């Protein structure tokens, strides 16, 4: 029914710099740089500075927006929160190898930017996966048959994990019985 004003605000930690211009959000922190293009959202983004204190707030609002349009405000705020988390703490995904008979042989290429899977269900084919930008994959030493993906972009890290998982799908078998694969087991922050 076109609610007049739907607004939501988020606090910004003092250790992160943020710039907004034409719905282009630039985030800077100790771990590096992140960028997002929110041009596809018909929302108004504003950065409020507290002169007396010096703190930062990001306010996103929609005017005369329907429910569908208003649903994007929280999405944008969560995306900005994820950017801040990635630039301050970073993102770490953990994957575990699951197999019944054939151990999965994983080889990490140079730079921790590519992975080779060789013995999935005793298959002679070699599966190649390349990590996305800013995401590095390593083989854990404290946990058996575990892969650690570290990055600054939650979306890129999760997409790399999804690529690894989907590259090892079982076919022509009852997947309920043949549970072999590589699956995401934990999501968290590097620090």
């Amino acid at each position: 029914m076109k609610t007049i004003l739907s607004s939501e605000t988020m606090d910004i930690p003092d250790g992160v710099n943020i710039k907004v211009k034409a719905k282009q959000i630039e985030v800077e922190g100790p771990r590096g740089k992140l960028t997002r293009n929110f041009k596809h959202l018909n929302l108004d983004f504003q950065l409020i500075k507290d002169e007396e204190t010096g703190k930062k707030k990001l306010k996103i609002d929609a005017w005369f927006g329907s429910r569908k349009t208003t649903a994007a405000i929280r999405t944008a705020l969560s995306h900005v929160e994820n950017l801040i988390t990635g630039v301050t703490k970073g993102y770490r995904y953990k994957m575990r190898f699951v197999y019944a008979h054939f151990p999965i042989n994983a080889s990490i290429s140079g730079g921790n930017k590519a992975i080779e899977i060789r013995n999935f269900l005793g298959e002679k084919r070699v599966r190649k996966v390349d990590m996305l930008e800013g995401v590095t994959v390593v083989r854990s030493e404290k946990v058996k048959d575990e892969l650690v993906l570290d990055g600054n972009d939650i979306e890129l890290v999760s997409r790399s994990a999804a690529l690894i998982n989907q590259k090892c799908h079982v076919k022509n078998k009852d997947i309920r019985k043949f549970l072999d694969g590589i699956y995401v087991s934990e999501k968290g922050r590097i620090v």
Binding site: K2, I4, D44, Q46, F64
Partner: protein, 130 residues
Amino acid sequence: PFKRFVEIGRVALVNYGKDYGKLVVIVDVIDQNRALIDAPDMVRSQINFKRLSLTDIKIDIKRIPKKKTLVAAMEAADVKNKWESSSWGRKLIVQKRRASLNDFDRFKLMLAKIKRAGVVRQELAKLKKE
């Protein structure tokens, strides 16, 4: 962002219809499409927002004020003089004057413009040569 909002006391310009060129004050809001407007030389009435162009002028008034109160607020804010002095307001006045010019006045203006253009061209050529 959003330098202008529709508000109680906001001065708008009628940009369409028989009342084009007139300043009105938004004294109330009926709904998302129309608002209640007033002014010294009309009867308070509803108008669609599509026929209004918001200005940068705003007066301090309560909703649906009396005619005398509205006039006093407008005079205190000096809405007329500010609008006339602003480039946006001066545009309509200049268009009206240009339309109102007559044949002899247009000839005199043409002579003045030709002389000014000649002098400006001489000055610019000398400036370039310097």
